[PDB]
Design a protein around this ligand. Structure first.
Ligand code: 3OB
Lengths: 403, 549
């Protein structure tokens, strides 16, 4: 097994990303890991002649684990892992009854990496209080977290799975980075049995491998926009209901508002109860129906980037929306001990779903301070990938419009 | 010497070739001095003569009563590759563990004692010109890391690391810190055993071509390093003299703020806000700025703080960090970190306006966050916090707020001023309370604002603002509703902008208007705010839109 030549395109260099400060326990965890990986040949120390850097973190059980943030390198390697050696996404996976996610990142440590590409995989284990220059390394094998790793490895992946696929042609396996997504319509005992059998396949070839045991894609649905079914209606309640519907008309074809406006006639007290007209009730129930169904006119565009918006609804409740063009929702949903811990679980849930549905992860609009998130996200992060994120102020109206 | 260490391989920037810079004709004194300097260096192996074949050239200059060679590596620096940065940060004295003995060892001729990549040396060529460039100049190239070259700092540090690596592995008991030409060795060994351990280090360094200072020439503590003083069991910033001046120039105030910022590291309660406000606008560097009264008050209080010297303690890893924060003036915050009550490891302050409108609860979190990041950097862990806010106040805020805010272990400490929410918007419309439908509208071209309102109690009103944006009019509209109203009130607006601002419970803002609105909001007993879509034909909003248009 000799290396596959890898490229960057002509007009962009490697990643030069700052290493974020790490707690001592993570730094210690990281050096043990990195000592083993150097002994085992997977990485080599590097000198200052390598001007590239990619952040690394520690995550979890009680087993520590190394996570490398290749988001920049992935961004700059886009042509390679998407066009040259792309992995197509099966539209069937979302339809399956149960979908189990298996970690297959160990596979990539056996395949060597293009000698002329290894410099772009440089990372630093930093020092506490900058006592030392920090331990610099780079990969000799395919690194977990890079999108080129599975792109290269897929040929070897097909071989491993070929017998299982032949023997189970109504099960669909999908590589996304360090995970295989394995979906069947089988009953759960058989599904789990078939997973255990797939483990054994991978156990040969040397691979000892917000979410329950499995996902359940077919049971995913749009969280509809909640129109309250009130016994009595004040002017405020109508005003609330109108804004809801007004903004919903900008997403959904044929949301009507007319009737309810006429109820808000002149200049009333907000407190004031108001009798409900007939056509108002009509339009209201007609809108209700529209919001249950998916948005007519909106479709996934593979060229455009997915984007996820998340709102804190209080009481451990989080709403979210996926779309490509603003406020044209491909999917919306919900998630039920602390604010960052929840937000990170939410991001992971939403991302997993995005991968199952489109084979891409969304760029997140996170309702939080940049520094808070960056300090804490790794503490509860359990995923092998890291989605793109930016930091945003939640417009408090949109928080209300999604319950 | 020149270290045996294997060279670090160096490239130029992919699509570039090394410098072909014309050597300027130099003066005889300079031509003479260079040759003398080059001979002395050449015989130590630092440089080597080379043939006329090598096409690369860099200017050399001589400058004084020793003569010094100055090589202009500017073109080579553009053309030589980027390297990895030397350090992610600089250590803080507060983060240093306490040792029984520490010694400073500086490497002699650091860069010159380290070999350059054989394949790169050709690019370092320079020419000592003949008197009035009559004849071919003498041609040299570096075998070692040149002074002022882009890669010298990194490769040196890198080389030095590899050289220490064995000694570190053999001696985990000892602690070393690399900083430029210097090494700082520390241990808990009894003084006799330390000297020996230093000796075999100094030897180990010389085994690898690195000369260091004799025990008689080593510096003694305190160590004046990077603006700090490092004593046997305490540290502090180097002495701060606040200039006694009649007139203060911009320059003087900048040097003062800088000095105060530096001092705030260990001196608590240092303030700079009123001194900073003076620097606003842009004046001449030499322009005399009259000190305002509040500037004069801060300066005095700072002079009181500096009157007696204060020291920071070193870090003990088997104790907990504890961070305390105090409010001191709007926007301004001060913190102390310690492990044993009031034996401070370090001090600091936070006083930035993240955004336009904020409240003490929001700012305390930003302060805590800033301190948390700083602790992780310095000690690799976050402190237990001691905060001037009630759990119940915090509980109320974070739950109701839309952003995800979280902070680690903290306890309330009654150290007034105490952080509080100065008003609380109502969750429901207020029965038996006037409903003001406010609205604003600024004509884009004339900028003639028409802020006004209509109520369900019958009342109307329209003032006329001048040179205001639509944002101002919609906000002036709301100020009116608060002004002309009872202790209870319900305000309807079609401005999400204003809603957004006010739903955040700001108790502090840059805008004059917003602070006026805050004043009102504190004075009220109950306020409820609601939003509607503009121009959608709403009973109330359409009426206000009329008189506003
Ligand atoms: C070896 N090392 C990284 C280290 C120290 O060495 C340093 C570290 C730094 Cl960033 C700068 C300098 C200078 N210029 C010296 C100092 C202390 C503080 C300390 O323990 N001291 C301060 C100096 C000192 C001097 C003599 C006897 C005892 C002590 C005790 N603790 C340490 O671990």
């Amino acid at each position: 097994i000799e290396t596959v030549p890898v490229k960057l395109k002509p007009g962009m260099d490697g990643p030069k990303v700052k290493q974020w400060p790490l707690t001592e326990e993570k730094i210690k965890a990281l050096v043990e890991i990195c000592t083993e990986m150097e002994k085992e040949g997977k990485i080599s120390k590097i000198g200052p002649e390598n001007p590239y850097n990619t952040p690394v973190f520690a995550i979890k059980s009680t087993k520590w684990r190394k996570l490398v943030d290749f988001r920049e390198l992935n961004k700059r390697t886009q042509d390679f892992w998407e066009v040259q050696l792309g992995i197509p996404h099966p539209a069937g996976l979302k339809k399956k009854k149960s979908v189990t996610v298996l970690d297959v990142g160990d596979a990539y440590f056996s395949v060597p990496l293009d000698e002329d590409f290894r410099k772009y995989t440089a990372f630093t284990i930093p020092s506490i209080n900058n006592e030392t220059p920090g331990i610099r390394y780079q990969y000799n094998v395919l690194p977990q977290g890079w999108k080129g790793s599975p792109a290269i490895f897929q040929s070897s992946m097909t071989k491993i799975l070929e017998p299982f696929r032949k023997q189970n042609p109504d099960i669909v396996i999908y590589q996304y980075m360090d995970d295989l997504y394995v979906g069947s319509d089988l009953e759960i005992g058989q599904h789990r049995t078939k997973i255990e059998e797939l483990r054994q396949h991978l156990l040969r070839w040397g691979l000892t491998t917000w979410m329950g045991y499995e996902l359940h894609p077919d049971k995913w649905t749009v969280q509809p926009i909640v129109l309250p079914e009130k016994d009595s209606w004040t002017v405020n309640d109508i005003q609330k209901l109108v804004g809801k519907l007004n903004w919903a008309s900008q997403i959904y074809p044929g949301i009507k508002v007319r009737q309810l406006c006429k109820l808000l006639r002149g200049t009333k007290a907000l407190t004031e109860v108001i009798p409900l007209t007939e056509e108002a009730e009509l339009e209201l129930a007609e809108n209700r129906e529209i919001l249950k169904e998916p948005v007519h006119g909106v479709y996934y565009d593979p060229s455009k980037d997915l984007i996820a918006e998340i709102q804190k609804q209080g009481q451990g409740q989080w709403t979210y929306q996926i779309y490509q063009e603003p406020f044209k929702n491909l999917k919306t949903g919900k998630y039920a001990t602390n604010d960052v811990k929840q937000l990170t679980e939410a991001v992971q849930k939403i991302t997993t779903e995005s991968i199952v549905i489109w084979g891409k992860t969304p760029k997140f609009k996170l309702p939080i301070q940049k520094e808070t998130w960056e300090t804490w996200w790794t503490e509860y992060w359990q995923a092998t990938w890291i989605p793109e994120w930016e930091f945003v102020n939640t417009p408090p109206l949109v928080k209300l419009w999604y319950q | 010497p020149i270290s045996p260490i294997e060279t670090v391989p160096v490239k130029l920037k992919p699509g570039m070739d090394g410098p072909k810079v014309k050597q300027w004709p130099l003066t005889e004194e300079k031509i003479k001095a260079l040759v003398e300097i080059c001979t002395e260096m050449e015989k130590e192996g630092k440089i080597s003569k080379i043939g006329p074949e090598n096409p690369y050239n860099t200017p050399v200059f001589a400058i004084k009563t020793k003569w010094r060679k100055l090589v202009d590596f500017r073109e080579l620096n553009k053309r030589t590759q980027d390297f990895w940065e030397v350090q992610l940060g600089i250590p803080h004295p507060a983060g240093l563990k306490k040792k029984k003995s520490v010694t400073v060892l500086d490497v002699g001729d650091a860069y010159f004692s380290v070999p350059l990549d054989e394949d790169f040396r050709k690019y370092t060529a320079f020419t000592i010109p003949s008197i009035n460039n009559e004849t071919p100049g003498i041609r040299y190239q570096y075998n070692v890391l040149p002074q002022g070259w882009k890669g010298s700092p990194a490769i040196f540090q890198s080389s030095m690391t590899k050289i220490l690596e064995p000694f570190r592995k053999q001696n985990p008991d000892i602690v070393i810190y690399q900083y430029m030409d210097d090494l700082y060795v520390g241990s808990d060994l009894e003084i006799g055993q330390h000297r020996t351990k230093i000796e075999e280090l100094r030897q180990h360094l010389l085994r690898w071509g690195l000369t260091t200072p004799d025990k008689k020439h080593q510096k003694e503590p305190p160590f004046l390093w990077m603006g700090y003083e490092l004593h046997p069991d305490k540290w502090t910033v180097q002495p701060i003299v606040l200039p006694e001046k009649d007139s203060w120039t911009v320059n003087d105030i900048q040097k003062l703020v800088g000095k105060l910022n530096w001092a705030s590291q260990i001196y608590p309660g240092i303030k700079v806000r009123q001194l900073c406000k003076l620097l606003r606008g842009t004046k001449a560097l030499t322009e005399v700025i009259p000190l305002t009264e509040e500037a004069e008050l801060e300066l005095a209080e700072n002079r009181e703080i500096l009157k007696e010297p204060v020291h920071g303690v070193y870090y003990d890893p088997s104790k907990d960090l504890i961070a305390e924060i105090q409010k001191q003036g709007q926007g301004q915050w001060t913190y102390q970190i310690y492990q044993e009550p009031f034996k401070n490891l370090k001090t600091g302050k936070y006083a930035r306006m993240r955004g336009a409108h904020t409240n003490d609860v929001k700012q305390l979190t930003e302060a805590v966050q800033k301190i948390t990041t700083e602790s992780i950097v310095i000690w690799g862990k976050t402190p237990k916090f001691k905060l001037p806010i009630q759990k119940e106040t915090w509980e109320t805020w974070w739950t109701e707020y839309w952003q995800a805010t979280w902070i680690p272990e903290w306890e309330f400490v009654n150290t007034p001023p105490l952080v509080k929410l100065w008003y609380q918007l109502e969750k429901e419309p207020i029965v038996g309370a006037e409903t003001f439908y406010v609205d604003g509208a600024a004509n884009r071209e004339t900028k003639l604002g028409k802020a006004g309102y209509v109520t369900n109690r019958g009342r109307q009103k329209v003032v006329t603002l001048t040179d205001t944006t639509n944002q101002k009019t919609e906000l002036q509209a709301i100020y009116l509703a608060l002004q002309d109203s009872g202790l209870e009130v319900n305000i309807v607006t079609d401005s999400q902008y204003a809603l957004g601002i006010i739903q955040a419970q700001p108790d502090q803002s840059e805008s004059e208007l917003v602070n006026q609105i805050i004043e009102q909001l504190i004075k009220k007993e109950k306020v409820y705010l609601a939003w509607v879509p503009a121009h959608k034909g709403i009973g109330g909003n359409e009426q206000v839109d009329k008189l506003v248009s």
